[PDB]
Amino acid sequence: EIVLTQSPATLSLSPGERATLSCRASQSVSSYLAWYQQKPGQAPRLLIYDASNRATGIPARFSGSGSGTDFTLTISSLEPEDFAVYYCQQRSNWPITFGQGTRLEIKRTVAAPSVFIFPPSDEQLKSGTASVVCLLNNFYPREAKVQWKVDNALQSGNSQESVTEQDSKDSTYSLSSTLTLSKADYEKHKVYACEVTHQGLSSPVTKSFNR
């Protein structure tokens, strides 16, 4: 098959700035290179076909260029609706293949998260499991370090985190971190703490409860 490599994987830019997205093929695809936009929850949208032709109704700020193996989608002055994932697709050769995408994210001023910790419920503890949840609300950039401490000892391997899509109103993120223990283990400890490290925080914020 023809492999298409997209770079960069992620791109952070402000509205009004220019976006330059690269697609490179493992062998020539001539001009048979299309570009797609895809928002979360939504089907893909054709932007460009034949390397450089805009699909019907696509704003003029979208332009494609290239031939052979090296292609570029340029968005000359970014709009808020332009922040999405972008895929290239070749139509030269069986099988039809796609790049793995470039995620285009809104660059925003730094915003520190507000942090909340939740103990497990009494309803859950009867089932023999304890989920401790830590919430970071409305922060930018996406990069955050959230660590769990139990009786002040840093935890490892026993939590998972999940992040929302960029907010359509304020361009921030929200994040959950979930600490999972057995009820038994949970009841052996005294203090449960979520320590959060972020560019918007001069020093780490810690939220805790005593079981």
């Binding site: 893909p44 032709n53 099988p95 419920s121």
Partner: protein
């Protein structure tokens, strides 16, 4: 209106079969090449199959050959996919898509459906448990939606009357093979004694609706 509408997705075990339909209206279906394209949760697009307007030319993805059969009915403006001996890694959202190609070499998928989700698993469907994340200026509260299979679960707050400040997080696949998500909302602390907060959880695959009131 120009529409493509797919259906037939479902949860089936490995080795079993599914038939997908893609019903078109509002454009000349018989003029165009049609495609099936699939997308795994969190992943990129992967082409499955293609059929020309006259059904005389057909293409298949490599992982799919000998197992999947594409077909169309121009008079019914419908496109089909017979999927045989299904595997876990066939799990995806399946799209049908119309090409712009018309007597030329211009290639582009300009009209897409919404997708039908196919889940291939040995694991039986299981409804969630719903636990409160109780509130401790601005407060936060939520619901933990734990141990369900398969995706999706949907969450609303106060039967849809609360939307501002809500964050319903992408599910996580736990080592148990079961999914978990939290849904949160931040609220003014002042309203905690006065305002009622209920999360409405729905898990269609198990017919589960749960309303959990979340309190101090």
């Amino acid at each position: 209106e120009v529409q493509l509408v797919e259906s037939g997705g479902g949860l089936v075990q490995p080795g079993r079969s599914l038939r997908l339909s893609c019903a078109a209206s509002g454009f000349t279906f018989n003029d165009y090449a049609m495609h099936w394209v699939r997308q795994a949760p969190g992943k990129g697009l992967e082409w499955v199959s293609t059929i020309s307007w006259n059904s005389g030319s057909i293409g298949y993805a490599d992982s799919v050959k000998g197992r999947f059969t594409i077909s169309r009915d121009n008079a019914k403006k419908s496109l089909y996919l017979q999927m045989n001996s299904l595997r876990a890694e066939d799990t995806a959202l399946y799209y049908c898509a119309k090409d712009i190609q018309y007597g030329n070499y211009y290639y582009g998928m300009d009209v897409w459906g919404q997708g039908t989700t196919v889940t291939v698993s040995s694991a039986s469907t299981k409804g969630p448990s719903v636990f409160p994340l109780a509130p401790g200026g601005t407060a936060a509260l939520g619901c933990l939606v734990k141990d369900y299979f398969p995706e999706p679960v949907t969450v609303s707050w106060n039967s849809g009357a609360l939307t501002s400040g809500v964050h319903t997080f992408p599910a996580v696949l736990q080592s148990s093979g079961l999914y978990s998500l939290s849904s949160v909302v931040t609220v003014p602390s002042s309203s905690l004694g006065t305002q009622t907060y209920i999360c409405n959880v729905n898990h269609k695959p198990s017919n589960t609706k749960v309303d959990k009131k979340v309190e101090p």
